[PDB]
Design a protein around this ligand. Sequence first.
Ligand SMILES: O=c1cc(N2CCOCC2)nc2n1CC[C@@H](C(F)(F)F)N2c1cc(F)cc(F)c1
Length: 550
Amino acid sequence: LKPNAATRDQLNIIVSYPPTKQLTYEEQDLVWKFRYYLTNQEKALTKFLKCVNWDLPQEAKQALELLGKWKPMDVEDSLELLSSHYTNPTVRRYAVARLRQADDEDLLMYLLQLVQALKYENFDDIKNGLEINSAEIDSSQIITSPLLEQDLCTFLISRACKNSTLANYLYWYVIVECEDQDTQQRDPKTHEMYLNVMRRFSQALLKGDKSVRVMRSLLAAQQTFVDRLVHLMKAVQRESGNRKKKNERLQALLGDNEKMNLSDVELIPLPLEPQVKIRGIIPETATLFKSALMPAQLFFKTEDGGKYPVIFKHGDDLRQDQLILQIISLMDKLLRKENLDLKLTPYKVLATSTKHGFMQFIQSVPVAEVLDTEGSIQNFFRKYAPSENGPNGISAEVMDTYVKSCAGYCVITYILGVGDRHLDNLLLTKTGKLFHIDFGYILGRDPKPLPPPMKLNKEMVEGMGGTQSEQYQEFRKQCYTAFLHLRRYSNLILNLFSLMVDANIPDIALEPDKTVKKVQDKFRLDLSDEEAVHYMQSLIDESVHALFAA
Ligand SMILES: O=c1cc(N2CCOCC2)nc2n1CC[C@@H](C(F)(F)F)N2c1cc(F)cc(F)c1
């Protein structure tokens, strides 16, 4: 029952293994022998369930007995049991039981991955939860046409019926999976499941009280607003002529409220940010971007009489950008939790389908435009935010914001392996905030062969006041600090990426088995905290030396 000091130390090495590290048959036989001892440690549960052969009924039964007696696992470890690796229904009920203890704030951060976990859930239990050919059921028409106890589908709907923000995101995350043409063709049973999830969610909203019934009518109003906006986008993209002829069509159709109903609507929540209620799109200030993809810049009239600028794209998959931005939002929240605000810009991204979606426009000037107009980053900051007492004639608040945003994004783009990095993707604000846009290349993927691991640039270093400035010393300091805090939440970041292997993300579908390993290698879990600091310092030293030696 109780192992000796040598075996106790040997079991600790097995528990300390990174998520990718697979246990050998003799290694998992040792874990199985002392399964009753390991119940006192919550971190051992992940390693014990790796030993079990789920095709063997008694081995699965014995694991379930130990599962109930084991120390209550963390929310980050519960996400691993909802992945492709664990298809046993009882295991998934215990994973759902731990999410029930977690707050709605935490549940929102993993919601995109929780919708993806439905793929591994029991499809019959989902269908038999309702009180024809799958093509006959249009997902967009479900909400607009009204007539260890809980599983993942029952839990997500139950929590959504209580929280309006959670209901908003759960709706649009399921709608995208329904509209997924790849899932519709390669596995119709998965497509049918997502339709039943939507049909069950619509049914539970109608069954609910006055405030619950109001939620589905607002969701129907959001879908109708989106469907009309898509029809507007199609007509503008199909319009023969230049950008000016297309802009005139966009402004005229938006203004015609009797035909399109987009300029004047009742106070409805914005699908991108449900906390922000909208009056409609301003027709006179809506124009298309210079891009061939034809994205539209739309200004939304808020409840408070403000302006919410958005980038509504049509004919492009926002799914890859949606994941990266939700990970940046998680990483920012994790860094803020450890009392380190690196002034990051995790702009809201919401796909309304696999073909169309919204993007939160942040008032910023790209570094390419900054160089073409002002010459350098420092000249731009000295023009819009000057101070004589501050460093290099630039405001102390703005410079501090710049150093933190440069250090913050340097670590994040390194871990996420963000490729195709040029001055048009690097965006700068008048407040100091530096951020990355257009995440078309991630997890080592890059159009150029042999890309650098750290995406540092000569202009970023020049903006800090050189390599000898006290701002660059702060950059190095905030770089290893950000790396140390993110390494502490490595299990959380990797388990969410593990739940995204079957998601139709172009850069994940390329190498699904290697996805988790790609992120894990960047964290350098083989090295200690003190070693990780010097490795981060070595990455900066190498990148800086390679940059000037162009
Ligand atoms: O994915 C994104 C996100 C994004 N941002 C803007 C800042 O807030 C966050 C969202 N902007 C853009 N893109 C795609 C490429 C272009 C396009 F949309 F115009 F094509 N675009 C863009 C790029 C610029 F350099 C200047 C500009 F005004 C728009």
